[PDB]
Design a protein around this ligand. Sequence first.
Ligand code: ZN
Ligand code: ZN
Ligand code: ZN
Ligand code: ZN
Ligand code: ZN
Ligand code: ZN
Ligand code: ZN
Ligand code: ZN
Lengths: 468, 794
Amino acid sequence: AEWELPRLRTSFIFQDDYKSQDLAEFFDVKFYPYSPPGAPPVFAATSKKHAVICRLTQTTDKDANPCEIIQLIRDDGNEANCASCWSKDPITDQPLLCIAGNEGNVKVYNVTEGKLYRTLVGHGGGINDLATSPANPYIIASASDDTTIRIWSLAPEHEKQPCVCILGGEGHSYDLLSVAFHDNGRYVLSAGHDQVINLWALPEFPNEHMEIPIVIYYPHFSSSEIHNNLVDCVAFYGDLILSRACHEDTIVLWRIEGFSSDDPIPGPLDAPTPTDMTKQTRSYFTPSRPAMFTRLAQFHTPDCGVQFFMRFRMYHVPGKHPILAFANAKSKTFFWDLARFGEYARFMADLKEAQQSYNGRVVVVDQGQGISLAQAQQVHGPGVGVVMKPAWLVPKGFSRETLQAWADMYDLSNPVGLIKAHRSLAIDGAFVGRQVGWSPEGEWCVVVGNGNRALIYQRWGKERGLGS
Amino acid sequence: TEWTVDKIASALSVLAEEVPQNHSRLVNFLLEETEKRAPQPRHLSKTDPFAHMKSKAIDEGVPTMDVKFKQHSGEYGKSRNSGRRFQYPVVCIKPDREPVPPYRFHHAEIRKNILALNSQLNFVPPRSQKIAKRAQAEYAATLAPYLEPWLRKLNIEGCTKSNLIRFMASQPESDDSMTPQQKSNLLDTYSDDMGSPQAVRNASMFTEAWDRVFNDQSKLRRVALRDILMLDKNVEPIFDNKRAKALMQKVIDALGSYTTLGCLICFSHDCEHGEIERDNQKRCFSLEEIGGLMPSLRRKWAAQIEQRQHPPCRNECYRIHGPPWSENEVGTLEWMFATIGYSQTLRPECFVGAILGRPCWDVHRKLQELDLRLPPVEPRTIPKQKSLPWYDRRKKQLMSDWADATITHEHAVRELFAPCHHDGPCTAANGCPCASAGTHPVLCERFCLCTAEECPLKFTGCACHSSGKTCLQRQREGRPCICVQLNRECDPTLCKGCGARERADPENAYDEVLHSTGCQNVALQRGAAKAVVLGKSQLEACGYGLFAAEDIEEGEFVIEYTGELISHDEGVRRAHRRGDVVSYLFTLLEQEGIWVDAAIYGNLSRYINHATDGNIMPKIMYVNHEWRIKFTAIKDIKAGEELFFNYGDNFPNLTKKRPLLVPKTTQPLFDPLSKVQLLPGQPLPQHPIDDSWLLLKHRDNLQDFIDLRPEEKEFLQEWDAFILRRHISSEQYLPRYFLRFVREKADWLVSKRSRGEEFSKLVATLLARRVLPERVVIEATQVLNDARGRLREQ
Ligand SMILES: [Zn+2]
Ligand SMILES: [Zn+2]
Ligand SMILES: [Zn+2]
Ligand SMILES: [Zn+2]
Ligand SMILES: [Zn+2]
Ligand SMILES: [Zn+2]
Ligand SMILES: [Zn+2]
Ligand SMILES: [Zn+2]
């Protein structure tokens, strides 16, 4: 069961709300992250004018609808929106949905009671992305056309001046498209049209009124060299970095040399400064001249074309396989199970090992049957070498084509290779993905995009054989 | 051991197989580590907050939207039918707040103009070669750590990293890639002897074999051996251009860091003065700009001998009395000796004694036993010269057709030449740039080596004095202020009668009684702006504007226009990077090509809007050898009124060529940092200027010099971090801040031998310029001996 990947289960189209009769899009989707373990998963999908809040419930009836819309909010102002994140009321613990758009304000909605909690005002241009700190649910970051990141606190002591930090200076020079928090809540990634990816270290913020935000002038790592185009999505994966740029058809996995979240957080006066204007990479963290970053792997996402503002999402929870999902600009959704890479490498090593110590006389048997590395050794005894193969390793002695298909999906030996998706699901009609979200227990994966369309994928389902 | 290119290349190909094997192991390791460190979800609520909420699907007057659902199953995603449509009621929510007016970048305040480096254009709102070189650099970094283990494994005579570097240096492509002095430094670490004939042969074959295996011109990921060798940590410094640089040659060489970097205006070693070249090499505005140590030191001597006619140190003074020396200690004794010079009242013994840890009779013992000889200094005959018909430097007056005879007052046409440092009269015959470098002569200024006695071009200040206000634009005296006439502010040293000495001192900036009389021509130095407040402009189609927060009388100084000082080409690059070709670049010196860019760094003056009938007026002023922009009220202005000036031609399109309160206004007003809306009658926000980011840049600039030793960087950065914060532009205030520095850093200075040594070189350089009075060196001896005494507590 642990190796299962999702399949399409439900899809819906939400009425066009930017009328032109279907140029509306869902730009964001986010599952609520603060519910008790096991609670029915709830996500918000954000269109230009609406926040569509849905609960997903697993069903034994294959014809039933797992998706119920429990709240539908319209931004009754002039702003058109494209970014969302979840927070909580610090007094009441009620869910708060933050929504932001082309006027440069964050609206914070009390979604259960359907009213405005507050507005966060101060950005000088449209906001393109929002993220909540994993370490403090009252702390949120916004990325703007004004080229800055603003950090906000919803904590009651900051109510009169809720901007606690501005990431400014010269690190970014054009519209920002993506902002992301490290799990420790102290490192922030930002990126956008200037093709720069910056990593910033946040100070601790006093739990009292701050008359002015703290201003940070220098990122602790900065590079325009990982991509050759505008960067529209960045994230931490542990301490590693994932990012994608326009025109490249890849998601790049890479790392900052010397960066570890186990080390002490540097203070703002440890950051590097641009003393040499020909250097397009600089780093506080750096441990023959050393590279400051290493490209590790590239996930192949074909047919993104010239489209940008397309975001991927990793599912990363203790005890479950890490899954990367992303939808392209040509009606495909892609998944990679990152645990397959290690199992493939183990298998190929066991396979090569047995080819030597048995001169080529080796037998491969599928795992996940009644058969073991024992019951299979009893059938031929010490004369043969028996190697166990993962069931999801399917062919097409293995042929070259079979080995090449496997390497295309699971071989990690080339940093500028292209890793084929482990599952690739076709979408009906013309579709461009904007955002992906995962339910807390990973059984649901929701892709949203143009035509105000939501695609809802499921695994570990409960269906039991027609019900209509 | 009979190697060929073929055999080496075949062996490299086999060793190369571990590169993708190591990479796969690394990535799988990192992935497995990251999988294990997945975070637990935090801040979970005890109950499901959505549990009570039911589907809003409709089974009056409420807005409604449609949603069509489809169900899918199988591996292909086939729909079970064509879909079921539902209707939902909509909760409409308005925001309670408007956005602030738009802007780009985080706007940060600077106390004074800062000097920008030239930037590259890497992005606009040959590509193919940027892409290829990035790919090659990544591969080169991947391969570099394999070279030495592979060479150890192959164990080929003459195939060592050092010998492959010597071979690289000897090849023809090193002419296509290196320079004279770079070869020089390579062949000092490496030499050009590559060993036996077979060694030279093997190194050649290895290089050819490497370029065959790894530098195939078919691939995007290719790297020549030369590319990896240039990464070597003993090679790359040679291709690094961040370079700062009998008896007297020793002193000159010893004080070189200070004579080269030390600013003549603000006394910092990394600062906002000087000139940035197109490759961002910097010519500092330092002693080297006016001939180095000797022409200034020679004049000090000459003037010292042309004077023809206290308590002893508390370090066992040689004036009461009278362990082997290192050459450093001797050197210290020499440069102090040479720059103290023919002094009547100050003697090296005591100060050198406090600098080293030595008693004052000791360095006299060493001094006498070494008998150092000061070069002979001729009497400097001043050949007498006619006064000029347009300028009398003794009555401090302009006469006749002065406006036609000089461009001293015409900043838009001025070009910046080094202050003159020739040996003779300031004439065209002598190549004095002040007399002759421009269309007309300009006055000699305070950094020219000539004196007011010799030179009739020498500016000597204004003569104004009054118990009332003076040095005014429209002087009641009937004798005008020459400083005002020359579009310059008064000089705290030269303008002795008007009280500029006290009024140009920022420490008196808010002494309103002082400033109510005397010099009214030091407003930029005083540094006090009228109270102003950011707001939404009254002009539709403008965003922000700036509003008076107090009454302003006609003729009063309002504010300075600060920003980044940039060249013309940098201005064009910036406009293109910003999308414009909305880019406002204030022309500071048109002919010299200096603009002020406030798009990111500046102050609130950047928000003042254009009007044809403005209420303030900009003016470019000469201020102690800086050019700066002030604004003056041309009408009475009431608190709450918006400020405007006529942009005129100040912003060229470069590509196409009594507590302080928030006032009552109709317009919303904003805190400039939090952008919080201000309420009338609240205290007006006045946030202190945050400068630590700028001090860090200047510290790091010094840290990057390849030819500065760590001991020098340490002291230079300590002095700069202190002195940059005082924003000095006049030598009138240096002795005070020098003495504060010696007191605050006394313990630090005596704790480590190199710090005292470097501090003495600073002292020596400023003595040689006669910019540091002898009395503060005397007092500094006491402070250092004091602290050294207090340190004898182990
Ligand atoms: Zn300076
Ligand atoms: Zn003495
Ligand atoms: Zn001259
Ligand atoms: Zn001169
Ligand atoms: Zn002169
Ligand atoms: Zn005067
Ligand atoms: Zn004057
Ligand atoms: Zn004056």
